[PDB]
């Protein structure tokens, strides 16, 4: 027969994630020297819908 | 049917026969009559069958009374026996 | 059926050429011997792609085999084969009727 539905997902033709409105990738801070041997102080500026 | 024979080449099997019927065609015509008018063991006409292109001498018909020297690679039993009736020998050339 | 262990039949071994005493045996097929001609041609042909190449016989209908009965002489030891008809129960020697 023809190719069933779940075999056709992995091509990524029309199934790619909708990503126009996303703010950015939600990651922690990159582990530098100051975060590995002390602390650093940061300000939260706005909390926002993604 | 039989056994198989790998790499056959018809140069190991070249051996054309020659009946004692012919046996005088190898001598040319103008020399043919002279040795028939001689029963001499002194002068027997030498026949070299290998130069004519004949492997084996076979005895089929009967030859005249004249003694003949025959040179060949192979002769048979009745072919060699019939020449000794005429008083001729067979020299096995190779 | 029931055949005797001893049987006096004609021999041929360049000396006997007469009715001499024999001993009975039953024929059994030999070992397959994979270095024969047919096995080596069959093994080279199955090697590779293509799957099965020779026919493989399926439809069996017979229920018996022919009794093949070879007889060993006791003087010259020349063996000679001899056959019977198709039969189902084949014992030999004992149980005289």
């Amino acid at each position: 027969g023809r190719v069933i539905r779940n075999q056709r997902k992995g091509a990524g033709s029309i199934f790619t994630s909708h990503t126009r409105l996303r703010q950015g990738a939600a990651k922690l801070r990159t582990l530098d020297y100051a975060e590995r041997h002390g602390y650093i102080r940061g300000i939260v500026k706005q909390i926002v819908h993604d | 049917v039989g056994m198989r024979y790998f790499h056959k080449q018809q140069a190991h099997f070249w051996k054309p026969v020659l009946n004692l019927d012919k046996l005088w065609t190898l001598i040319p015509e103008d020399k043919r009559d002279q040795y028939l008018k001689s029963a001499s063991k002194e002068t027997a006409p030498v026949i070299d069958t290998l130069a004519a292109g004949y492997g084996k001498i076979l005895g089929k018909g009967r030859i005249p009374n004249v003694p003949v020297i025959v040179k060949a690679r192979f002769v048979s039993k009745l072919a060699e026996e019939k020449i000794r009736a005429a008083g001729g020998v067979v020299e096995l050339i190779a | 059926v029931n055949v005797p262990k001893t049987r006096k039949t004609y021999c041929k071994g360049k000396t006997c050429r007469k009715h001499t005493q024999h001993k009975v045996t039953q024929y059994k097929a030999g070992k397959a011997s994979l270095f024969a001609q047919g096995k080596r041609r069959y093994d080279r042909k199955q090697s590779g792609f293509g799957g099965q190449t020779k026919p493989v016989f399926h439809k069996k209908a017979k229920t018996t085999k022919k009794v093949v009965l070879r007889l060993e002489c006791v003087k010259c030891k020349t063996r000679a084969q001899l056959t019977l008809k198709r039969c189902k129960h084949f014992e030999l020697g004992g149980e005289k009727k």
Partner: protein, 93 residues
């Protein structure tokens, strides 16, 4: 009778017919005249030895070989390298 013809292949592509048999012969004799003017005093072919043929069927005959030897050229009294310029074939093997 059974007769074996080997024509299942696409044989009509590879058919060569020799209409140039009388054409190439005329174009070959013009080579043996053009060479005979370039090689102008010289006899157009080297000198060939005398050789007895192999293979029991044919050993009764004698045949023109390829070249003489390093030995037959020495016994005639000349070197091998001077022999090829005079016009004499030399086979080393």
């Amino acid at each position: 009778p059974i007769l074996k013809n080997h024509f299942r292949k696409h044989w009509q592509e590879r058919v060569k017919v020799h209409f140039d048999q009388a054409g190439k012969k005329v174009s070959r004799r013009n080579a043996r005249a053009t060479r005979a003017a370039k090689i102008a005093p010289r006899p157009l072919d080297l000198l060939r030895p005398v050789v007895r043929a192999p293979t029991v069927k044919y050993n009764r005959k004698v045949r023109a070989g390829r070249g003489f030897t390093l030995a037959e050229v020495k016994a005639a009294g000349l070197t091998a390298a001077y022999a090829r310029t005079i016009g004499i074939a030399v086979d080393h093997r």
